[PDB]
Amino acid sequence: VDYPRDLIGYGSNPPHPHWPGKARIALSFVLNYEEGGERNILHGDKESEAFLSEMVSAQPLQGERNMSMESLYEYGSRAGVWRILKLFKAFDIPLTIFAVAMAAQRHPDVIRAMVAAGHEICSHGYRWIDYQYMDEAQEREHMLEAIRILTELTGERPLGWYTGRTGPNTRRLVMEEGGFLYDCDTYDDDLPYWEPNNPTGKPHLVIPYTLDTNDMRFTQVQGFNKGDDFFEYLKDAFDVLYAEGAEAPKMLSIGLHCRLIGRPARLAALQRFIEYAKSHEQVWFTRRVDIARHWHATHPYT
Amino acid sequence: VDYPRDLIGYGSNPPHPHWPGKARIALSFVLNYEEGGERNILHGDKESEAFLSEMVSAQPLQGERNMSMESLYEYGSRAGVWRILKLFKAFDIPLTIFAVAMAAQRHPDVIRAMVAAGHEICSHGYRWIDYQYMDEAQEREHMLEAIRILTELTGERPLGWYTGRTGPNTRRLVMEEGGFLYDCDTYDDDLPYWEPNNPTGKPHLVIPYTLDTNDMRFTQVQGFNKGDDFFEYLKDAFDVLYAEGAEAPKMLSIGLHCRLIGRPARLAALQRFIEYAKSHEQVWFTRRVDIARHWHATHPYT
Amino acid sequence: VDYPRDLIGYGSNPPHPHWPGKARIALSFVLNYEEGGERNILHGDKESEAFLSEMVSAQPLQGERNMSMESLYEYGSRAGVWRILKLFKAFDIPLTIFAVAMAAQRHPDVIRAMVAAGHEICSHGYRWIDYQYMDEAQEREHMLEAIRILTELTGERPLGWYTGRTGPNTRRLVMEEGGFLYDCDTYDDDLPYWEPNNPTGKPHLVIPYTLDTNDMRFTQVQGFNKGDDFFEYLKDAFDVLYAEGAEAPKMLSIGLHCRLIGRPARLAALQRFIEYAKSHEQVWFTRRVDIARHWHATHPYT
């Protein structure tokens, strides 16, 4: 008898994080880069992409090419990413980039442009796909293959990972890997915690990510019609955490995608919230690597 | 010739409930607990969970494990439930817990923590699944099995039931069971009524539940984009009942799930409504068991 | 070479209707009654109902019984219909009832209760289903069978029809039938027009209905989250027609369903609009039969 799920975690007693600056909230802004990395027969894929694009009802096409799907992704790398990088640089808030190995190759300039802005480049896997079914063998060297590309693309290896479309073996291999300080393949808490089942023994930091305060909802069945739906949602999820942080601060992730929030219609909202957030004192805008290194010092694994 | 459906009920003449305090409305706040109880091959299930999670387009996976799906549920037990329990305790309004036997085992501390707050623990079945197809035999001892777990988990047996994903045999077996005062496997009225087709002869109270003033809509195709959609909906459904209650009071159910409303973004709305509701006199916040025992005394079965 | 579709109609020259009272708009409020008439193995159906219910992602079940689905419909006949009848009687605006033969049997009291309020009872077919595939033979006597039930249910035959889920043969048979003054199985205009392809030769009036200013959208993938979405939509579609009616009045249909708008949450919106509409002079609230008889006198078939 063994349950491979921790349904309880900290329970009624979440640790206090003591965010630098005495912030009542810690905000993680995340910009993915998957454009170019997505499904495509050109990449070897047996079908075209269908996930997160204006084509909200798109289906995959076996041994076909979704020219439309492709164009919409192309907006993310071509136009969307730039516009967002100005927004964040504009307010001096830093980013964590969930960058997919194959996309980074295909647009190394923009990666190096991020790296120079001081944004942290976290690994988003070798390719933007669903690992759920992948064989353990072929999945393990996607990771090391991804680990190699970004080190050579960036100058330093990635000490963070996030697959997203995880298969079971995924979070294990991350931890078995070695050189990662954290992962984000959880949406299970409002705070970071050390992975309880690390075979490796070495401390492993978990920084849960989000599928609700994620701009991906602008293209899902359930999701924002206008910008303001995203914004009101972010304000809400801010207000409630800030209010809690008067005695017990927590964090909040914000997921952005080049092809979605980068569209001017939706960018308006993202800036709206930034300004909102910025108007409150005791807010720590930060990269996830900093949250990991903050945790290490603050609440070292025991 | 026999129609097994009562399409008429009270017709033009709903009974007046005389809610304690002379309230013009009776409000039933319900917090489900299904996290840990849901579909999973670890539980014997042939496929992973797909119902009510941020993964609004998730499909079931035969003999697979949806690590993502699991994590999102894990948020309900780990973080969501606690935050909500503070909200309700915060306003001194009481709850009725629709608790699923298997989840209660997996987190007995939080169940006992509820029981101590004074919230009523109603049965939500042995496992959170779709009974629609289950064989009468194997379904009947899920119930008694569920009936045993919560008595031993709580100190008293459950005198209420709600499966949700009912099969035909379900509401019968509930009534054939014996020790239940009511059930909630109806969404067919704005007031409680005695089950008209109880083979058992013994009075059986029906307290219709809701799939519209339910936070579940935040993850369905049709459903709230921002918090305010839930809230405006609740205000509306409040305003119209309160206005009616000037001469004929009725009730209103509110369905909450740990993994959904417990997310800070959506909690803001839930509190918004509570405050709204609280600002009106002649409102009876109550547990369903109290509504059953209120009915017994007020409008005894004949 | 023959195109069985009139893509042009009145073109740039819609006729002026000269609505009684010199109204700048004519409003058709329609309340369906399908509850009890819907799909069900008890009715002979090979599967349960799945269309328009809170169960926004429900699927049909072959030789099964959706107890949940049924309960939600039961709300329409049990509670929803009554509450709405008060709303409309409350403002003295009259209704056109799209009543399905099988539902009318199952709740004759409420039908006769409508008839006494002075509302017009239009035929909605024998059963609430999809005729698209039905054989011409078995479909033709559904209609006459439906035609018989409501005459005996009401005192007068139905001079109007609307199937909704039409099959090709449907609108023909309506016209071949004989005693109907109009039908509504079109959503193709903002005004009534005589059917251009009536084999019968006898004048046939078309009164297009709506699938957008229909409360059905509260349960479809695309559709209102809160009441206000319905209301804002109705105000818009009112404002634009009223503004046009300064020189060229038109009509507007409003589709309501017992099980959907009758829920207090959504009723609030419906009343909101009524009040809105009521606040403007030169608005003709009317039954469709009156619109037919108005047309006859005003713009007789040539």
Next chain:
Amino acid sequence: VDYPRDLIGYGSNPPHPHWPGKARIALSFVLNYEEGGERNILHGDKESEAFLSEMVSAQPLQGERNMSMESLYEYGSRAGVWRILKLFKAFDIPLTIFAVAMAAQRHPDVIRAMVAAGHEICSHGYRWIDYQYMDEAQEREHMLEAIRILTELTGERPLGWYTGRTGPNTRRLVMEEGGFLYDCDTYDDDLPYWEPNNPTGKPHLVIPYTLDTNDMRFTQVQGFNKGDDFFEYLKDAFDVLYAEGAEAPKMLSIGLHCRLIGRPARLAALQRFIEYAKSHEQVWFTRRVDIARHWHATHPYT
């Protein structure tokens, strides 16, 4: 090794367009005409239409006729188109018509009526369908067949194209064709650019279109509930571009469909935005052909 996708385009350096009048934004209003051109067994199709109609969950029917689907399209040609033509003529802003060959035949009067208003008639293909799978041979003379119809329908050939539901061969054949100045079968930028892979050698202008600032979203799973969702979206996507245009102007496409925006409920929003847009100086309302000819002179292919 050859990647058939330009993921980078202008990168960090989009060209300045110097819009006539020194406008800080260039607005492309587009009204499609597909009604009559859509899928239908009468047209040879093996199934009925299912894309973009109030029937938001409609499925295609093999060798069948969706009478309902048809009626809803019929609203676009019969009523919707006219009402919109007044709106745009009302404000003196000009249109680009994406007109589908088969629809234009079926309603030549309305086409010639557009042509006389001074609106540009761009080709939207021979038939409104999905070319993705079409054989290169039979697809190539759809285009020339479409090219012939509109020249004879309009007086001048179409120097622009947009299929929408493109297959790979599509944009190639457009360029191989010869007499087109641009195409719009991209959604990959916020500015026009010369096609980088034109086999023909001759300059080919790309004017990316939109699937987000498109009224089509009113009938998709993700999309506007009320008018205001469309409008707020347009204001946002306007505000952000206008703000950028203080130093670097760009354009914005607006997709409209007769059967969707032409409904009074949604027309209100479209006018709302027009007025909004109109209230700002330095806005260039224009046809796409003018944007092509503007580009030619301003930023000639090299």
